[PDB]
Design a protein around this ligand. Structure first.
Ligand code: MH0
Ligand SMILES: Oc1ccc(Br)cc1
Length: 137
């Protein structure tokens, strides 16, 4: 289930973080407007860029902590307010997060592995709800 999937993802997190974020950027190319340095690059070129690997991993490192702290795929309101208040998220709306979790769920469905894709779908919805409650537009 969800808790084991957090362990699976942490067991290879760099490669999952990069592959899911690439899935997101390829499915939603307009999302590169927040990553202007990632424009005009192939997947392999992005995987050569120090901040692509470093920032994506740190994003997924915190996503896994938020997932681990959740009850029944419902994140803590403290985690939601943190994600809202971060300066690096000043521009964002809940729609950006919805799209990421759509890409994460689709990655999981297409994988060879017994990921609890339904739990991740709930988590993404619960996280968007929590972000809205904590004041993200
Ligand atoms: C596609 C929009 C978007 C979404 C969705 C998003 C969702 C999330 N975020 Fe987060 N985040 C987004 C856009 C950014 C930006 C633009 C930056 C700052 C610039 C950059 O390239 O790192 C950022 N996020 C930066 C970060 C960093 C700092 C990276 C660093 O210092 O290297 C963390 C930890 C982070 N986020 C957390 C998270 C978590 C957890 C989620 C849960 C999915
Ligand atoms: O640097 C970043 C990588 C992935 C996401 Br999602 C957000 C920021």
């Amino acid at each position: 289930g969800f808790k084991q999937d957090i362990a699976t993802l942490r067991g290879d997190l760099r490669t999952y973080a990069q592959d899911i974020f690439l899935a997101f950027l390829n499915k939603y190319p307009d999302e590169k407007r927040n990553f202007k340095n990632y424009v005009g690059k192939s997947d392999q070129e992005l995987k050569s860029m120090a901040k692509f690997g470093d920032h994506t991993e740190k994003v997924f490192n915190l996503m896994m902590e938020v997932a681990d702290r959740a009850t029944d795929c419902v994140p803590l309101a403290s985690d939601a307010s943190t994600l809202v208040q971060m300066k690096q998220h000043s521009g964002l709306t809940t729609g950006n997060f919805e799209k990421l979790f759509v890409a994460l769920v689709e990655y999981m469905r297409a994988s060879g592995q017994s990921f609890d894709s339904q739990s991740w779908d709930r988590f993404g919805k619960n996280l968007v709800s929590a972000l809205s409650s904590a004041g993200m537009k």
